[PDB]
Amino acid sequence: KIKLLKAAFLQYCRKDLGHAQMVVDELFSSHSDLDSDSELDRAVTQISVDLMDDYPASIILHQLEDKMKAHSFLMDFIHQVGLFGRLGSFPVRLLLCEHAEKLSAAIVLKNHHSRLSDLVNTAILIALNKREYEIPSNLTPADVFFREVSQVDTICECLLEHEEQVLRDSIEWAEVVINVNNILKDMLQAASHYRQNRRTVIIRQHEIVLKVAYPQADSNLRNIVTEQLVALIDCFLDGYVSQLKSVDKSSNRERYDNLEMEYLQKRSDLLSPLLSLGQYLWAASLAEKYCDFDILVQMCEQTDNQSRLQRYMTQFADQNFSDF
Amino acid sequence: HSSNVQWRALSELAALCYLIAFQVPRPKIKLIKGEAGQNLLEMMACDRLSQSGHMLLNLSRGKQDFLKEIVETFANKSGQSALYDALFSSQSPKDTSFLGSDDIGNIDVREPELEDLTRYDVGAIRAHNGSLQHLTWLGLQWNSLPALPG
């Protein structure tokens, strides 16, 4: 109940000064606790996750940095007092701490980038979710657009499609559709390196692949490459997250695990074809990123005279010969 | 010396190289300490644009807007690795090699104008000390063009 998650949120406050007293409220917790694994332990998971949601709900950047440290001495004040169990990730809602970490480094990666075009796509993205208090206080806000920033990505995309409907593409309008590509990209670079220090999200990425495909149809050479090294930087983070979820699930209920394979395999084919017009200098890195997707790098070696590449492919491979 | 398949692919690769060179702007001549130094630097600039220029053309006369294809296909970073591959042995570290790290951005992919080419040649006559080799080459390069050299 609410009386409990307000008692550990009171023991973490003291868990910054001393421990002894907090270690006896975790000791009173283990004896007074339920201790039936299947849901009462996911009743204290629903508490540790309701306080990670409140250390994320918390000088707007130096104030969001102070909150990635707070949620860092909150993940250390859980490892010690322990806090060595519970997990209610299920569907849509331990991986939930990391995820709320990753999205607080995303909140600081778009705080570090503040210009008039993103701040406008953000104000359009927040006025659409609800109204804002007009007692000044107009960021128009962030502390709740952090716990949910995933949404200011699918909307700062709908504000690049209405800024592309007026783009009239015309050159300065294909420079504004790349500036956003570069931010959603290095906001996905910031969640990757925060995991190294350990269906709307995805749609908005397959939507900007196709809009990064319509533009290189009319673009000065060099520019059409930098947005191609970018949509290659981004596609290589999606294929890496479907690989990591595969490896997460295995065995029984396999039927669902061999149906999600066909789905990622019909997309590394839809990202390959897309790169069939593009430069094949990136194929070598796309073929290595989803380190097999051989059918694509095998038909790039066939379209050219690089019988040297299909010999360099089979030189470093596990059963490609029986595949080629 | 090599076969036809390598020729086209290599000439394709070379066309990109000459293109990259031609695109490079005229160097900032005023920025040099002395008159001799700056005049030299400009002389070389004219030589670069002239030699690469005629080559770019002679390779583009082979087909219709052949240049456009070269950029659209090999301006991709994939070409940068295909260039390093054909030129060098891959064993060398690809990090400290300038070729592998250059930012090939917005290749003009615009064939050269004859009038510009003429003033490049004239300015680069002294590039190779006016060797009859130099001039006989230029004179031959203009032998296929509709405008004649000065």
Coordinates of C-alpha atoms in Angstrom, one line a residue:
Chain A
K1 CA 0.0 0.0 0.0
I2 CA 0.9 3.7 -0.1
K3 CA 2.0 3.6 3.5
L4 CA 4.8 1.2 2.6
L5 CA 6.4 2.9 -0.5
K6 CA 6.3 6.1 1.7
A7 CA 8.3 4.3 4.4
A8 CA 11.1 3.2 2.2
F9 CA 11.1 6.5 0.4
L10 CA 11.7 7.8 4.0
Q11 CA 14.5 5.2 4.6
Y12 CA 16.3 6.3 1.4
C13 CA 16.3 9.8 2.7
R14 CA 18.1 8.6 5.7
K15 CA 20.2 6.3 3.5
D16 CA 22.2 9.3 2.4
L17 CA 23.2 10.3 5.9
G18 CA 23.6 6.9 7.8
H19 CA 22.6 3.3 7.3
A20 CA 22.1 1.6 10.6
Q21 CA 18.5 2.8 11.1
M22 CA 17.6 2.1 7.4
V23 CA 19.1 -1.4 7.6
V24 CA 16.6 -2.1 10.4
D25 CA 13.6 -0.9 8.4
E26 CA 14.8 -3.3 5.7
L27 CA 15.2 -6.0 8.4
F28 CA 11.7 -5.2 9.7
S29 CA 10.7 -5.4 6.0
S30 CA 12.0 -9.0 5.6
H31 CA 10.2 -10.3 8.7
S32 CA 7.1 -8.3 8.4
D33 CA 7.0 -8.8 4.6
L34 CA 4.8 -11.2 2.8
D35 CA 7.5 -13.3 1.1
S36 CA 5.2 -15.0 -1.5
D37 CA 7.4 -14.7 -4.6
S38 CA 4.7 -14.5 -7.4
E39 CA 3.1 -11.1 -6.5
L40 CA 3.8 -9.8 -3.1
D41 CA 7.4 -9.6 -4.2
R42 CA 6.1 -7.7 -7.2
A43 CA 4.3 -5.5 -4.7
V44 CA 7.7 -4.2 -3.5
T45 CA 8.8 -4.1 -7.1
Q46 CA 5.9 -1.8 -7.8
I47 CA 7.3 0.3 -5.0
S48 CA 11.0 0.5 -6.0
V49 CA 9.7 1.4 -9.4
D50 CA 7.3 4.0 -8.0
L51 CA 10.2 5.8 -6.4
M52 CA 12.4 5.6 -9.4
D53 CA 9.5 7.2 -11.2
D54 CA 9.6 9.9 -8.6
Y55 CA 13.3 10.5 -8.6
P56 CA 12.8 11.0 -12.3
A57 CA 9.9 13.4 -11.7
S58 CA 12.2 15.1 -9.3
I59 CA 19.0 25.7 -14.0
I60 CA 17.1 23.0 -15.8
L61 CA 20.0 20.9 -16.9
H62 CA 22.2 21.2 -13.8
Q63 CA 19.0 20.2 -12.1
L64 CA 18.5 17.2 -14.3
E65 CA 22.1 16.2 -13.7
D66 CA 21.5 16.3 -10.0
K67 CA 18.7 13.8 -10.7
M68 CA 20.8 11.2 -12.5
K69 CA 23.1 11.3 -9.5
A70 CA 20.1 11.0 -7.2
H71 CA 18.8 8.0 -9.1
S72 CA 22.4 6.7 -8.9
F73 CA 22.7 6.8 -5.1
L74 CA 19.2 5.3 -5.2
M75 CA 20.4 2.4 -7.1
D76 CA 23.3 2.1 -4.8
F77 CA 21.1 2.4 -1.7
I78 CA 19.1 -0.5 -3.1
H79 CA 22.1 -2.7 -3.9
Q80 CA 23.3 -2.4 -0.3
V81 CA 20.1 -2.5 1.8
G82 CA 19.0 -5.1 -0.9
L83 CA 16.7 -5.1 -2.7
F84 CA 18.0 -8.3 -4.5
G85 CA 14.7 -9.6 -6.0
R86 CA 11.4 -8.2 -7.5
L87 CA 10.7 -7.7 -11.2
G88 CA 7.4 -6.7 -12.7
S89 CA 8.5 -5.7 -16.2
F90 CA 5.8 -7.9 -17.8
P91 CA 4.3 -6.0 -20.7
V92 CA 4.5 -2.2 -21.3
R93 CA 5.6 -1.8 -17.6
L94 CA 15.1 -4.4 -12.8
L95 CA 15.3 -3.6 -16.5
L96 CA 13.0 -0.7 -15.5
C97 CA 15.7 1.0 -13.5
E98 CA 18.2 0.9 -16.4
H99 CA 15.4 2.0 -18.8
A100 CA 14.6 5.0 -16.6
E101 CA 18.3 5.7 -16.4
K102 CA 18.7 5.6 -20.2
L103 CA 15.8 8.0 -20.6
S104 CA 17.4 10.5 -18.1
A105 CA 20.5 10.5 -20.2
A106 CA 18.2 11.2 -23.1
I107 CA 16.7 14.0 -21.2
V108 CA 20.2 15.5 -20.7
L109 CA 21.2 14.9 -24.3
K110 CA 18.4 17.1 -25.6
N111 CA 18.8 19.6 -22.8
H112 CA 22.4 20.0 -24.0
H113 CA 20.8 20.7 -27.4
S114 CA 18.5 23.7 -27.1
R115 CA 17.7 25.7 -30.3
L116 CA 14.6 27.4 -31.6
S117 CA 13.5 24.5 -33.9
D118 CA 13.5 21.7 -31.3
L119 CA 12.0 23.9 -28.6
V120 CA 9.2 24.6 -31.0
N121 CA 8.6 20.9 -31.9
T122 CA 8.6 20.3 -28.1
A123 CA 6.0 23.0 -27.3
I124 CA 3.9 21.5 -30.0
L125 CA 4.4 18.0 -28.5
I126 CA 3.4 19.1 -25.0
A127 CA 0.4 21.2 -26.0
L128 CA -0.9 18.1 -27.8
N129 CA -0.6 15.9 -24.7
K130 CA -2.3 18.5 -22.5
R131 CA -2.5 22.2 -21.6
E132 CA 0.3 24.0 -19.8
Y133 CA 0.0 26.3 -16.8
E134 CA 0.6 29.9 -18.0
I135 CA 2.0 31.2 -14.7
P136 CA 5.3 31.7 -16.6
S137 CA 6.8 28.3 -16.0
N138 CA 7.2 27.5 -19.7
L139 CA 10.0 25.1 -20.6
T140 CA 7.2 24.6 -21.3
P141 CA 8.2 21.7 -19.0
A142 CA 10.5 18.8 -18.7
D143 CA 10.4 16.9 -15.3
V144 CA 7.3 15.0 -16.7
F145 CA 8.5 15.0 -20.3
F146 CA 11.4 12.9 -19.0
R147 CA 9.5 10.1 -17.3
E148 CA 8.0 10.3 -20.7
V149 CA 10.3 11.7 -23.3
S150 CA 9.7 8.8 -25.6
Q151 CA 6.8 10.9 -26.8
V152 CA 8.8 14.0 -27.7
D153 CA 10.5 11.9 -30.3
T154 CA 7.4 10.8 -32.1
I155 CA 6.2 14.4 -32.1
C156 CA 9.4 16.2 -33.0
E157 CA 9.0 13.9 -36.1
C158 CA 5.5 15.1 -36.9
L159 CA 6.9 18.6 -36.6
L160 CA 9.5 17.7 -39.2
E161 CA 6.8 16.4 -41.5
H162 CA 4.8 19.6 -41.3
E163 CA 8.0 21.6 -41.6
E164 CA 8.7 19.4 -44.6
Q165 CA 5.2 20.0 -46.1
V166 CA 6.2 23.7 -46.1
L167 CA 9.8 22.9 -46.9
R168 CA 9.0 23.2 -50.6
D169 CA 11.6 20.6 -51.6
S170 CA 14.4 24.1 -50.7
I171 CA 18.0 23.5 -49.7
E172 CA 17.7 25.1 -46.2
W173 CA 14.7 22.9 -45.8
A174 CA 16.7 19.7 -46.3
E175 CA 19.2 21.1 -43.7
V176 CA 16.4 21.3 -41.1
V177 CA 15.3 17.7 -41.7
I178 CA 18.9 16.6 -41.0
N179 CA 19.4 18.7 -37.9
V180 CA 16.6 16.6 -36.3
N181 CA 18.0 13.4 -37.7
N182 CA 21.3 14.3 -35.9
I183 CA 19.6 14.7 -32.5
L184 CA 17.3 11.7 -32.4
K185 CA 20.5 9.9 -33.5
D186 CA 22.9 11.0 -30.7
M187 CA 20.0 10.7 -28.2
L188 CA 20.1 7.0 -29.2
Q189 CA 23.9 7.1 -29.0
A190 CA 23.5 8.3 -25.4
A191 CA 21.2 5.4 -24.4
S192 CA 23.6 2.9 -25.9
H193 CA 26.7 4.1 -23.9
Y194 CA 24.6 4.2 -20.7
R195 CA 24.0 0.5 -21.2
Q196 CA 27.8 0.0 -21.6
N197 CA 28.3 1.7 -18.2
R198 CA 26.0 -1.0 -16.8
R199 CA 6.1 0.0 -31.5
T200 CA 5.9 3.8 -31.6
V201 CA 9.6 4.3 -30.8
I202 CA 10.4 2.0 -33.7
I203 CA 7.8 3.3 -36.1
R204 CA 9.2 6.8 -35.8
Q205 CA 12.5 5.4 -36.9
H206 CA 11.3 3.4 -39.9
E207 CA 9.4 6.7 -40.8
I208 CA 12.6 8.8 -40.9
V209 CA 14.5 6.1 -42.9
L210 CA 11.9 6.6 -45.6
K211 CA 12.1 10.3 -45.3
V212 CA 15.8 10.2 -45.4
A213 CA 15.3 8.2 -48.6
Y214 CA 13.1 10.7 -50.3
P215 CA 15.5 13.5 -49.7
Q216 CA 18.8 12.0 -51.0
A217 CA 16.8 11.9 -54.3
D218 CA 17.4 15.6 -54.4
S219 CA 20.6 16.6 -52.5
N220 CA 24.1 17.9 -53.0
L221 CA 26.4 14.9 -53.0
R222 CA 28.2 15.3 -49.6
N223 CA 25.0 16.0 -47.7
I224 CA 23.2 12.9 -49.1
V225 CA 26.1 10.9 -47.5
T226 CA 26.0 12.4 -44.0
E227 CA 22.3 11.6 -43.7
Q228 CA 23.2 8.2 -45.0
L229 CA 25.9 7.6 -42.4
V230 CA 23.3 8.8 -40.0
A231 CA 20.4 6.5 -41.0
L232 CA 23.0 3.8 -40.9
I233 CA 24.0 4.9 -37.4
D234 CA 20.3 4.7 -36.4
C235 CA 19.3 1.4 -38.1
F236 CA 22.3 -0.2 -36.4
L237 CA 20.8 0.6 -33.0
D238 CA 17.4 -0.9 -33.8
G239 CA 18.9 -4.1 -35.2
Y240 CA 21.0 -4.3 -32.0
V241 CA 18.0 -4.1 -29.7
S242 CA 16.1 -6.8 -31.5
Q243 CA 19.2 -8.9 -31.3
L244 CA 19.5 -8.3 -27.5
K245 CA 15.8 -9.2 -27.0
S246 CA 16.2 -12.4 -29.0
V247 CA 19.1 -13.5 -26.8
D248 CA 16.9 -12.6 -23.9
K249 CA 14.3 -15.1 -24.8
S250 CA 14.9 -18.8 -25.7
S251 CA 13.5 -22.3 -25.6
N252 CA 9.8 -23.1 -24.8
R253 CA 7.3 -20.8 -26.4
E254 CA 9.7 -21.0 -29.3
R255 CA 7.0 -20.5 -31.8
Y256 CA 6.8 -16.9 -30.7
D257 CA 10.6 -16.7 -30.9
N258 CA 10.9 -17.9 -34.5
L259 CA 8.1 -15.6 -35.5
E260 CA 9.9 -12.6 -34.2
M261 CA 13.0 -13.7 -36.1
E262 CA 11.1 -13.6 -39.4
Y263 CA 10.0 -10.1 -38.5
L264 CA 13.5 -8.8 -37.9
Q265 CA 14.7 -10.7 -40.9
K266 CA 12.1 -9.0 -43.2
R267 CA 13.5 -5.7 -42.0
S268 CA 17.2 -6.2 -42.3
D269 CA 16.0 -7.1 -45.8
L270 CA 14.0 -3.9 -46.0
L271 CA 17.0 -1.9 -44.7
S272 CA 19.2 -3.7 -47.1
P273 CA 17.2 -3.1 -50.3
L274 CA 17.0 0.5 -49.1
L275 CA 20.8 0.5 -49.0
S276 CA 20.9 -1.2 -52.4
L277 CA 20.8 2.2 -54.1
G278 CA 23.0 3.8 -51.4
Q279 CA 26.7 3.3 -50.9
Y280 CA 27.9 -0.2 -50.4
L281 CA 30.9 1.1 -48.4
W282 CA 28.4 1.1 -45.5
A283 CA 27.1 -2.4 -46.4
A284 CA 30.2 -3.9 -44.9
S285 CA 29.2 -2.2 -41.6
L286 CA 25.5 -3.0 -41.9
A287 CA 26.4 -6.6 -42.6
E288 CA 28.6 -6.6 -39.5
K289 CA 26.2 -4.7 -37.3
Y290 CA 23.5 -7.3 -37.6
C291 CA 26.6 -9.6 -38.1
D292 CA 25.0 -12.1 -40.5
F293 CA 22.3 -10.5 -42.8
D294 CA 24.5 -12.2 -45.4
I295 CA 21.9 -12.3 -48.2
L296 CA 22.4 -8.5 -48.6
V297 CA 26.2 -8.3 -48.4
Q298 CA 26.3 -11.4 -50.6
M299 CA 24.3 -9.7 -53.4
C300 CA 26.4 -6.5 -53.1
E301 CA 29.5 -8.7 -53.8
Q302 CA 27.7 -10.1 -56.8
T303 CA 26.7 -6.9 -58.4
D304 CA 30.3 -5.7 -58.4
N305 CA 33.5 -7.4 -59.6
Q306 CA 34.6 -8.0 -56.0
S307 CA 35.1 -11.8 -56.2
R308 CA 37.7 -10.5 -53.6
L309 CA 34.9 -9.4 -51.2
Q310 CA 33.0 -12.7 -51.4
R311 CA 36.4 -14.4 -50.7
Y312 CA 37.0 -12.0 -47.8
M313 CA 33.5 -12.8 -46.6
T314 CA 34.0 -16.5 -46.6
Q315 CA 37.5 -16.1 -45.1
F316 CA 35.9 -14.7 -41.9
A317 CA 32.8 -16.7 -41.5
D318 CA 31.0 -19.6 -39.8
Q319 CA 29.5 -21.8 -42.6
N320 CA 29.1 -19.1 -45.2
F321 CA 30.6 -21.4 -47.8
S322 CA 27.6 -23.8 -47.4
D323 CA 25.6 -20.5 -47.6
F324 CA 27.1 -18.9 -50.7
Chain B
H1 CA 47.8 -2.5 -68.0
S2 CA 44.9 -4.5 -66.5
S3 CA 41.7 -6.0 -67.8
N4 CA 38.5 -4.1 -69.0
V5 CA 36.5 -4.9 -65.9
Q6 CA 39.2 -3.4 -63.7
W7 CA 39.7 -0.5 -66.1
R8 CA 36.1 0.7 -65.9
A9 CA 36.0 0.3 -62.1
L10 CA 39.3 2.0 -61.7
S11 CA 38.5 4.8 -64.1
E12 CA 35.3 5.1 -62.2
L13 CA 37.4 5.3 -59.1
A14 CA 39.9 7.7 -60.7
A15 CA 37.0 10.0 -62.0
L16 CA 36.0 10.5 -58.4
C17 CA 39.6 11.3 -57.4
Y18 CA 40.0 14.0 -60.1
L19 CA 36.5 15.3 -59.2
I20 CA 37.5 15.6 -55.5
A21 CA 40.7 17.5 -56.7
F22 CA 38.9 19.8 -59.1
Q23 CA 36.3 20.7 -56.4
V24 CA 39.0 21.9 -54.0
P25 CA 38.9 25.7 -54.0
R26 CA 41.6 28.0 -55.2
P27 CA 43.9 28.4 -52.2
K28 CA 44.0 31.6 -50.2
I29 CA 46.9 33.3 -51.9
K30 CA 46.9 36.6 -49.9
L31 CA 47.5 34.6 -46.7
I32 CA 51.2 33.9 -47.6
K33 CA 54.2 35.8 -46.3
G34 CA 55.9 36.6 -49.6
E35 CA 55.2 37.3 -53.3
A36 CA 57.3 34.3 -54.5
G37 CA 55.6 31.9 -52.2
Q38 CA 52.0 32.9 -53.0
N39 CA 52.6 33.0 -56.8
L40 CA 54.0 29.4 -56.5
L41 CA 51.0 28.2 -54.6
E42 CA 48.6 29.7 -57.1
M43 CA 50.7 28.2 -60.0
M44 CA 50.2 24.7 -58.6
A45 CA 46.4 25.4 -58.1
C46 CA 46.1 26.2 -61.8
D47 CA 48.0 23.0 -62.6
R48 CA 45.7 20.9 -60.4
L49 CA 42.5 22.3 -62.0
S50 CA 43.9 22.0 -65.5
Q51 CA 45.2 18.5 -65.4
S52 CA 42.3 17.1 -63.3
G53 CA 39.9 19.2 -65.5
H54 CA 40.9 17.7 -68.8
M55 CA 40.9 14.2 -67.3
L56 CA 37.4 14.7 -65.8
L57 CA 36.2 15.7 -69.2
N58 CA 37.9 13.0 -71.3
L59 CA 36.5 10.4 -68.8
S60 CA 33.0 12.0 -68.9
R61 CA 32.9 12.1 -72.8
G62 CA 32.8 8.3 -72.7
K63 CA 29.1 8.3 -71.7
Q64 CA 26.2 10.7 -71.2
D65 CA 26.4 12.5 -67.8
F66 CA 28.9 9.7 -66.8
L67 CA 30.1 12.0 -64.1
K68 CA 26.7 12.1 -62.3
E69 CA 26.7 8.3 -61.9
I70 CA 30.2 8.3 -60.6
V71 CA 29.2 10.5 -57.7
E72 CA 25.8 9.0 -57.1
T73 CA 27.4 5.5 -56.8
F74 CA 30.8 6.0 -55.2
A75 CA 30.4 9.3 -53.3
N76 CA 28.9 6.9 -50.7
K77 CA 31.4 6.1 -47.9
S78 CA 31.4 2.6 -49.4
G79 CA 33.5 4.1 -52.2
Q80 CA 36.0 5.5 -49.7
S81 CA 36.7 1.9 -48.6
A82 CA 36.7 0.7 -52.2
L83 CA 39.3 3.4 -53.0
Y84 CA 41.5 2.6 -50.0
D85 CA 41.2 -1.1 -51.1
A86 CA 42.3 -0.7 -54.7
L87 CA 45.1 1.7 -53.8
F88 CA 46.6 0.3 -50.6
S89 CA 46.9 -3.0 -48.8
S90 CA 44.2 -3.3 -46.2
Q91 CA 46.8 -4.4 -43.6
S92 CA 48.0 -0.9 -42.9
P93 CA 46.1 0.9 -40.1
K94 CA 43.1 2.6 -41.7
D95 CA 42.9 5.2 -38.8
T96 CA 46.1 7.3 -39.5
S97 CA 45.6 7.2 -43.2
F98 CA 44.3 10.5 -44.5
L99 CA 42.4 8.8 -47.4
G100 CA 40.2 6.9 -45.0
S101 CA 39.4 9.8 -42.7
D102 CA 38.6 12.6 -45.2
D103 CA 35.1 14.1 -45.1
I104 CA 33.8 13.7 -48.7
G105 CA 31.0 16.3 -48.4
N106 CA 28.8 17.5 -51.2
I107 CA 30.8 16.7 -54.3
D108 CA 29.9 19.4 -56.8
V109 CA 29.4 16.8 -59.6
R110 CA 29.5 19.7 -62.1
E111 CA 31.5 19.2 -65.3
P112 CA 34.1 21.9 -65.9
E113 CA 33.5 25.0 -68.1
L114 CA 35.9 25.5 -71.0
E115 CA 36.5 29.2 -70.3
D116 CA 37.6 28.4 -66.7
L117 CA 39.8 25.6 -68.0
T118 CA 41.6 27.9 -70.4
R119 CA 42.6 30.3 -67.7
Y120 CA 43.7 27.3 -65.6
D121 CA 46.0 26.1 -68.4
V122 CA 47.4 29.5 -69.2
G123 CA 48.2 30.1 -65.5
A124 CA 49.8 26.7 -65.2
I125 CA 52.1 26.8 -68.3
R126 CA 55.0 27.5 -65.9
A127 CA 53.9 24.6 -63.6
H128 CA 56.3 22.1 -65.2
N129 CA 58.8 24.6 -66.5
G130 CA 57.1 24.7 -69.9
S131 CA 58.4 21.3 -70.9
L132 CA 57.3 20.5 -74.5
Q133 CA 55.8 17.5 -72.8
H134 CA 53.5 19.7 -70.8
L135 CA 52.3 21.8 -73.7
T136 CA 52.1 19.0 -76.2
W137 CA 49.8 17.3 -73.7
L138 CA 47.6 20.3 -73.2
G139 CA 47.5 20.9 -77.0
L140 CA 46.4 17.3 -77.5
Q141 CA 43.8 17.5 -74.7
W142 CA 42.3 20.5 -76.5
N143 CA 42.5 18.6 -79.8
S144 CA 39.2 16.9 -78.9
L145 CA 37.4 20.0 -77.7
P146 CA 35.2 22.5 -79.6
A147 CA 37.1 25.5 -78.2
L148 CA 40.7 26.0 -79.0
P149 CA 43.5 26.9 -76.5
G150 CA 45.2 30.3 -76.4

